[PDB]
């Protein structure tokens, strides 16, 4: 029993736009440098689609995440340390840039300088930003499937379809798309952290957010295999790996990331989750995966159970952490509604990024339909979205949670409705699915109403804490250049001293 | 009373204690000095001041006192102010530690020498308190005091009226006062500067 | 010269000549006489209610706008009625004993047209006699325990108020103030919060230092007793004062005062910059705010979140030694109330037979409040119900505040 | 350095209180047996400002508090707790924390404002008002202002720019303090009468 | 005729509430680390009195500033070049730390740590910040001489009372005392480039801000004699020297410096000057130096004037710069109501912060006094402050133009009393004093209301031009140690490229 704490999130995509609002505000504060700008941290995907890079979800190609062995032990996708080291001059699964796009620009200035005279009319034309040549065409890009571009069977390709009979929905009273936007998952069993040979890779004690030391990176270019979620992001400048920081710089001091915030749509909660390290990986060895839902779950802590809390302080738990924790939005739509569900937990890397499924339009039918359970508003059995495709992206297959949790938000607009047009009390919905009415009015006001606070309860990564925050404060950002900071050791060759420390010790004690 | 701006106070102890109309009433001897005066003396000339506190530059009552911008931007430390005129009297010195003190209590302090403190006055402005810069007392042989070490509070009896429609009890609104400026003190240079901190790190002021 | 501008000025302007004073003045013995003065100057002038006259008196941030919406949450007058308001200055000269030391006579301030034989005693005598006159409040109020009073008052057959008066009269229950050193009258849990009372405001440091604290003390003078002084007529008198009365000091604050480095415990509060909270000033119109730039660092909590704590253990601690209690509670008589309007023509003292004792004219209101120890923090963390069954006010005149309430459930939850 | 980072509590009181826990499983009864032995009593109050401060945690320390409270209340009075917290204006809530906690046990909640001499008595004599007064802009409405036993630019310095503004306006000033004070620095003209005589003046300049 | 630009300063000295809220700001923000920990940019002294350093004042001591040989060529105090560099080994003339002050800090947590049965009350007593040992006493400070603090004998040393008869100012009725806040002036000539050894010292040509080059500075400390302002500190720790940088980097985007915006008396104005280089030399140059004053203002030129817009726009200078220089406030206090003068002119550095005088409580007389000139109102030979000691300050002993600048201030005073008071119209002040009722009333406007907008009208210093703002928006920042930063030679022994810039090449053109 050790007990650590995150910042996890959750992404209610039955709200969700689809407007890449988040990707933009990402792109321009993070990845807009040659060699990242392919790179998209956050990315936004409409299924069914194959996604960014194409094919990410199929692991038999990308070789990404873990196995469990017969004898029960967990290695990765790519191969346990010995065969990984023996992929290491010439990753064999690596994604090429032609699985993310060719990125482009445009000679914007041909339109500015053409010269008079012209037979036609000037235009900007493409160019590549990896060659600086002309593109006679674009063919790719990172959204290229957005509103379901591009034909049926191509689309259909898409993981998610299997064991499924998808014939019936290329038929256009049958057509159906959803939106999936997603970043690092930030996981607990990190599959990159464990195929990186440098160690370049860790997760951070206070907060759990995965890094990719910029230093330590030798760029053996692994990891990026070794994610099966494909949000590691090779630099082809820097010639380093990049990824998602869960906007680390923000979080340290209680804000929240620049996707969660600048989401439109409302739908993104952040709040704490308390886990036991300690049964990381016997949760993420469960023989069927079918149980790593669940599993995980475990894994969570009651962070109003004084045993927890006491734990909790005796592991170094800041206060206003397990503070944050008692009110996490996340808490409550993972542990407690059952609303929220993992990305792909049969990947064994017990993500921090979940996901409460999407309502739909009812499916065609014979007539206009009767009135059901519900009464005018839709039965969980008439949804247009194949249950078993989100079972596929979220419960490793198995429907039974994602049919509670849609049917839970069904129930809580059945129980509303009855409400606020009949002004009458009817629970039977919400009976049926196991909610009880003050359950619903609390998932009501985080889901409806979604105050700010509300939706973002992000604690203080409290720096100060095993730290010198004063020198810190008094010398931080003067970057003249001292030569000094990355290292524990004050001796250094060009004879300097960090500026943000104190050099002339006290003598009085 | 009267509903108007009142100017005659006709209350029985209003009018008792001379106060039914304002009159001229010249400070109080609160007699603090005359009774300790000379009794430990250090060797060096002592002389009766009228203690003034008027609120500091380096703080905000005693917060901040203690914030070393506060503390480098003004004398670091515990000060008093003193006229050229009385200071050269008592043989002090521009930050000279000196000790100021009285039936109430001692504080330990260095001086601030100045033209523009009338002769017959000393201030130490309002709160620099007792926590940082303080060597030890040679008055009562414990760490020095504070300015409100030299003071005492007595009430006035005017303002201990209730029951009379202006003059009623009120939270913050009526009740006795803290007055504080009447206080005189008797003040010294210092001769031995000791911390009783056991570092051995003492001075002597000589002479 | 300068008079005569002044005026001169206030008559061609109609009043906009304005005198902005502090504590240069205020703070002297005979304040009311610097005050009057310089009032007295700008009412000649017509200057007091003109915009750009006036009486400036600027001192501390007195001025808490939002008065009579801040005055519930404060003293709990959402729960019960009333609160125990004391004025301090009385209090430290009694508890802290500074009127064993005083040098300064009623006597001597005295008209010189006055009766002397009218006003003996040692200045603390004219505040007990003050206090039960209704005219101050005290603290602690009674001798006895408050908390019995209603239990042997039905014992006696009668109603605690009545009981209370008649005890009173008797002298079976007596001011604590007559006796401030027997033992069971002197305050012994004192917290103290955004306030470095030994540092700054305490007046009389070595007097605080020895009978509040029971430490080592640099007063150099003798008390009363010691030079054969003449002993009060109202209060007690013993050779060997009572020292350390305080049983426990407990002090917030971010920084280690010099009041923190005198207590038994200190508290870690959160900084302006780490809490949020409401501020307002006499200088300006505005309303603003503290905001937490973020968390209080290491394992400081906001003054709310500390006594919210506190409120929490109490309420849990207290069981099986305090349940729902009734308690006698002295008030005394205030302005802007009906109450006001006590003694219109002298001053009678009940004690001394020259009038009846009664409660709220010439005597302290005798109030009864209820409370529910075992529910403080649930009180605490709660608007309570006399907001809706009374009312709200202040300065002489009260409101329905309703629709206040019903907003209030909706912005707070319930 | 300065800053308080952890609940702390006296040595000597946290020794007693443990060994009093350890005979007494209600912590109620662990005070009275501390506080009713005059040698153990007297062991951590003199031991006040006597350095031993050790590292506690809030469980403790609202332990113990609660405790002290519920005895005190339980065997002399509530009116036996009080609590000390000034200038509300200042940080509203901050204030109410403690005021509702004390109010609501029938602690007592002491005033300020008379304590700290900021009351002026003849506010509420003359007025029947506790204190309200005019708002810097107005400063700026007037054509004749007198700073009188007021240090405006270090006293008042947020404000300070309507004095010296208002002054373009063509309103003359003057400065009544015993000493050249910063506040002379922005008058017309200084008067320096000796301090604590000011009704003198004032009289004069009535009649 | 080189027309060049930059932001003056005014400070308005009869608004001084000498606070030093200005200097507490610069010191938070750019001076808190060891080894400039002594150092204050902006420092405000109370005059009379030595100041910081002491007596700083007296170019005989300290050697700091400019000097006309009889050729009529100037040369540093200090010396010509070779008499410079032959100082290098050890500068004679240098102030040492305890010319400043030696910083220190006090044992805090002794108060925390004290044992248990602690003999006496615990105490934090000061510590040196330069050797961390016990100091017996503080005997110095950066604002020792606040109000007056210290014998009249000792401040009256103050340079300023040169050729004045001073006795009677140590009189109790006559006593007077002012403030002086200041910081490096950002000299048209600056002394302080023209004595550095390694030409690290430059004068930006955009904005005229004057920078110490970190890279560059070789620690030679010789320029900190040549600033007669003794406005350069050496920072003992990293081996170089600091100035005021003028707060650049938000000047650079139109903001006002931090003192400016901090200054709660609301005395400091910020405003474009055009100035012409060309001219520098042969202003400061002129033979009697009671005429650089004005020497200086034939150097400031017309905003409004098409001649010199024209050129301007010739000269490179923004349109956006040469509007604000049509608004500047600086311009109108300094050029049009002559209220501003130069500080020490006489130094030769053409300095470009500025000071309007103080008024003062009229002089100690025999009686009450009469009305004067301007009612009850004084008249500038009334003053208390000695003219001839604020001529000393601000213009090289001519008392001409500091009485303008005071009878002009009275003269507005006159003019707004009759106005408000009287409700009547009477310029006979103003007349008087040659300024006409619209100026005394935008005087007024900017001088009483003094509204944000009017005291601070700071234009960009268009970073985008001659540059590439663009890779910069979107590479800055990002700090990892690419190595290539601060050449502009793209060789590196490290192989490695900028961050911030674009290495792929258009091929399109
Ligand atoms: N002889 C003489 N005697 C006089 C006076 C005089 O002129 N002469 N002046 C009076 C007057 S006018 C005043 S206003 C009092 O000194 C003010 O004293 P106080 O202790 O409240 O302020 P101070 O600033 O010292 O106390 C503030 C403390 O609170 C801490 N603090 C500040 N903010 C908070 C907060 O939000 N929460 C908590 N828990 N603590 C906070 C602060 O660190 C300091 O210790 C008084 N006596
Ligand atoms: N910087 C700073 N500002 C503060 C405070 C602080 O501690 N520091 N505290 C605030 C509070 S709570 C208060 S109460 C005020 C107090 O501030 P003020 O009301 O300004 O009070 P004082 O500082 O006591 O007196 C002001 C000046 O009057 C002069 N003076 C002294 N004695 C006399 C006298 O007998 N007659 C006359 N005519 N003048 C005299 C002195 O020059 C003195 O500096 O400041 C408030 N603002
Ligand atoms: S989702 Fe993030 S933490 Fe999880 S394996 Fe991929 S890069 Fe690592
Ligand atoms: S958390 Fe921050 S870095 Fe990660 S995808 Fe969101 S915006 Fe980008
Ligand atoms: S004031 Fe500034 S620019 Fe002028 S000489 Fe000194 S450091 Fe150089
Ligand atoms: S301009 Fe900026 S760097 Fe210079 S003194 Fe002002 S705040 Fe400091
Ligand atoms: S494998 Fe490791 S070395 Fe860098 S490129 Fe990936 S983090
Ligand atoms: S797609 Fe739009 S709805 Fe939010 S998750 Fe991204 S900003
Ligand atoms: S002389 Fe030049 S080398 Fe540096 S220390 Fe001064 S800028
Ligand atoms: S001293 Fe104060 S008035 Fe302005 S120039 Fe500095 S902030
Ligand atoms: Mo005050």
Redesign the pocket.
Same mark, same amino acid.
């Not at chain 4, 009188?148 to 405006?152: A, D, K, L, P, T």
């Not at chain 4, 004070?181 to 002379?184: G, K, L, N, V």
């Given at each position: 029993m050790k007990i650590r704490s995150q910042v996890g999130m959750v992404l209610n995509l039955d709200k969700a736009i689809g407007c890449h609002t988040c990707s933009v505000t990402c792109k321009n504060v993070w990845t807009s440098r040659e060699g990242v700008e392919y790179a998209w941290f956050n990315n936004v995907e409409t299924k069914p689609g194959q996604g960014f890079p194409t094919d990410w979800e199929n692991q038999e190609k990308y070789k990404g995440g873990w196995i469990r062995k017969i004898n029960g032990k967990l290695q990765p996708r790519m191969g346990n340390r010995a065969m990984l080291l023996g992929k290491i001059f010439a990753n064999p699964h690596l994604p090429g840039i032609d699985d993310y796009y060719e990125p482009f620009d445009f000679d914007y200035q041909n339109l500015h300088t053409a010269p008079e005279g012209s037979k036609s009319q000037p235009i900007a034309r493409p160019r590549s930003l990896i060659t600086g040549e002309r593109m006679a065409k674009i063919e790719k890009g990172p959204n290229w499937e957005d509103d379901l571009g591009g034909e049926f069977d191509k689309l259909a390709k898409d993981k998610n379809f299997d064991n499924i009979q998808k014939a019936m929905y290329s038929q256009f009273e049958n057509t159906f798309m959803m939106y999936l936007p997603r970043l690092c998952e930030h996981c607990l069993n990190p599959a990159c952290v464990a195929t990186c040979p440098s160690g370049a890779i860790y997760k951070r004690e206070e907060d759990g957010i995965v890094l990719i030391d910029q230093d330590k990176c030798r760029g053996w270019r692994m990891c990026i295999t070794g994610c099966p979620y494909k949000k590691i992001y090779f630099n082809w400048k820097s010639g380093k790996s990049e990824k998602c920081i869960f906007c680390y710089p923000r979080i340290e001091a209680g804000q929240p990331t620049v996707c969660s915030e600048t989401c439109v749509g409302r739908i993104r909660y952040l709040g704490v989750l308390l886990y036991d390290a300690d049964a990381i990986e016997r949760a993420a060895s469960t023989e069927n995966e079918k149980d790593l839902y669940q599993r995980q779950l475990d894994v969570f802590l009651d962070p109003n159970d004084p045993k927890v809390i006491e734990q909790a302080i005796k592991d170094g738990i800041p206060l206003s952490v397990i503070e944050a924790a008692q009110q996490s939005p996340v808490y409550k739509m993972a542990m407690e509604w059952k609303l929220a569900l993992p990305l792909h937990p049969e990947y064994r890397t017990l993500p921090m990024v979940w996901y409460v499924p999407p309502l739909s339009p009812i499916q065609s039918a014979a007539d206009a339909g009767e009135l059901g359970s519900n009464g005018i508003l839709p039965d969980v059995e008439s949804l247009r979205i194949p249950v078993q495709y989100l079972a596929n992206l979220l419960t490793a297959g198995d429907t039974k949670p994602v049919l509670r949790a849609l049917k839970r938000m069904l129930a809580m607009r059945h129980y509303k409705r009855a409400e606020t047009v009949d002004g009458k009390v009817d629970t039977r919905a919400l009976e049926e699915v196991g909610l009880t009415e003050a359950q619903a009015q609390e998932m009501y006001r985080y889901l409806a109403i979604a105050n700010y606070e509300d939706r973002f309860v992000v604690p203080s990564s409290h720096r100060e804490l095993a730290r010198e925050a004063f020198p810190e404060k008094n010398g931080c950002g003067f970057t003249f250049g001292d030569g000094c900071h990355g290292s524990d050791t004050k001796f250094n060759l060009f004879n300097s001293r960090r500026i943000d420390a104190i050099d002339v010790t006290s003598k009085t004690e | 009373l009267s509903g108007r701006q009142q100017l005659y106070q006709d209350h029985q102890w209003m009018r008792d204690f001379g106060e039914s109309l304002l009159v001229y009433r010249p400070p109080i001897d609160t007699r603090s000095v005359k009774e300790v005066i000379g009794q430990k003396s250090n060797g060096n000339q002592e002389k009766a001041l009228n203690f003034?506190?008027?609120?500091?530059?380096?703080?905000?009552?005693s917060?901040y006192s203690d914030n070393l911008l506060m503390l480098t931007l003004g004398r670091g430390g515990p000060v008093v102010w003193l006229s050229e005129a009385d200071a050269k009297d008592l043989g002090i010195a521009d930050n000279d530690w000196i000790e100021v003190f009285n039936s109430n209590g001692a504080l330990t302090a260095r001086a601030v020498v100045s033209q523009r403190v009338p002769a017959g006055?000393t201030?130490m402005?309002?709160?620099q308190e007792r926590i940082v810069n303080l060597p030890g007392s040679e008055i009562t042989q414990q760490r020095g005091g504070i300015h409100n070490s030299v003071t005492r509070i007595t009430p006035k009896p005017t303002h201990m009226i209730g029951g009379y429609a202006h003059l009623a009890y009120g939270f913050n609104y009526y009740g006795t006062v803290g007055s504080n400026?009447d206080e005189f003190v008797v003040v010294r240079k210092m001769k031995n500067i000791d911390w009783l901190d056991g570092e051995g790190n003492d001075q002597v002021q000589e002479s | 010269r300068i008079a005569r501008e002044f005026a001169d000025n206030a008559d061609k302007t109609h009043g906009r000549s304005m005198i902005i !004073?502090?504590?240069?003045?205020?703070?002297?013995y005979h304040l009311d006489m610097?005050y009057r003065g310089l009032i007295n100057m700008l009412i000649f002038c017509g200057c007091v209610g003109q915009s750009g006259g006036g009486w400036a008196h600027? !001192?501390?941030?007195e001025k808490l706008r939002p008065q009579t919406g801040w005055q519930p949450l404060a003293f709990a007058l959402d729960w019960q009625r009333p609160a125990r308001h004391m004025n301090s200055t009385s209090y430290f000269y009694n508890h802290s004993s500074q009127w064993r030391y005083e040098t300064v006579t009623a006597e001597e301030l005295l008209s010189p047209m006055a009766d002397k034989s009218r006003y003996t005693g040692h200045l603390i005598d004219f505040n007990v006699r003050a206090e039960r006159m209704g005219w101050l409040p005290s603290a602690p109020q009674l001798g006895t325990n408050p908390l019995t009073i209603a239990g042997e008052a039905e014992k006696a057959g009668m109603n605690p108020v009545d009981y209370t008066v008649k005890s009173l009269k008797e002298g079976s229950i007596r001011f604590a103030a007559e006796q401030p050193e027997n033992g069971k009258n002197h305050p012994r849990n004192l917290f103290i919060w955004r306030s470095n009372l030994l540092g700054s405001s305490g007046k009389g440091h070595e007097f605080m230092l020895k009978y509040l604290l029971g430490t080592e003390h640099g007063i150099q003078g003798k008390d009363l007793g010691q030079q054969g002084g003449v002993k009060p007529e109202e209060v007690d008198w013993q050779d060997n004062g009572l020292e350390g009365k305080l049983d426990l000091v407990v002090t917030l604050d971010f920084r280690l005062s010099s009041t923190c480095l005198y207590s038994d415990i200190i508290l870690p509060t959160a900084t302006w910059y780490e809490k949020d909270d409401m501020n307002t000033s006499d200088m300006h119109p505005f309303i603003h705010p503290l905001s937490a730039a973020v968390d209080p660092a290491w394992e400081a909590k906001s003054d709310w979140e500390i006594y919210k704590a506190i409120a929490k253990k109490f309420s849990e601690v207290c069981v099986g030694h305090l349940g729902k209690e009734t308690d006698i509670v002295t008030l005394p008589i205030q302005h802007d109330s009906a109450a006001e309007l006590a003694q219109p023509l002298d001053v009678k003292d009940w004690k001394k037979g020259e009038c009846d004792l009664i409660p709220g004219k010439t005597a302290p209101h005798i109030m009864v409040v209820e409370r529910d120890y075992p529910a403080t923090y649930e009180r605490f963390t709660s608007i309570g119900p006399l907001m809706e069954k009374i009312g709200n006010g202040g300065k002489g005149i009260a409101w329905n505040t309703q629709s206040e309430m019903d907003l209030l459930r909706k912005l707070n939850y319930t | 350095a300065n800053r308080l980072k952890y609940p702390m509590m006296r040595k000597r009181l946290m020794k007693m209180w443990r060994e009093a826990k350890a005979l007494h499983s209600d912590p109620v009864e662990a005070w009275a047996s501390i506080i009713e032995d005059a040698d153990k009593a007297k062991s951590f109050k003199q031991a006040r400002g006597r350095g031993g401060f050790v590292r506690s945690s809030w469980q403790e320390v609202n332990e113990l508090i609660a405790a002290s409270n519920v005895y005190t209340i339980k065997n002399y009075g509530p009116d036996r707790v009080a609590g000390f917290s000034p200038?509300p204006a200042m940080s509203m809530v901050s204030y109410a924390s403690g005021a509702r906690y004390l109010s609501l046990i029938g602690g007592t909640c002491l005033s300020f404002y008379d304590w700290?001499?900021?009351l002026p008595p003849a506010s509420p004599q003359t007025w029947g008002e506790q204190t309200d007064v005019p708002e810097s802009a107005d400063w700026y409405n007037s054509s004749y202002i007198i700073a009188?036993?007021?240090?405006?630019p270090?006293?008042?310095?947020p404000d300070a720019h309507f004095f010296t503004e208002v002054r373009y306006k063509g309103t003359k000033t003057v400065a009544?303090? =015993?000493?050249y %004070?910063?506040? %002379?620095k922005l008058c017309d003209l200084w008067l320096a =009468?000796?301090?604590?005589?000011?009704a003198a003046m004032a009289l004069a300049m009535g009649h």
């Open positions: - | 003034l506190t008027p609120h500091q530059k380096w703080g905000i009552h917060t006055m201030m402005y309002h709160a400026r | !004073v502090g504590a240069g003045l205020n703070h002297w610097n600027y !001192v501390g941030q | 200038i700290y001499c900021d009188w036993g007021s240090n405006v270090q006293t008042r310095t009544v303090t =015993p000493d %004070a910063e506040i %002379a =009468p000796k301090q604590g005589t000011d």
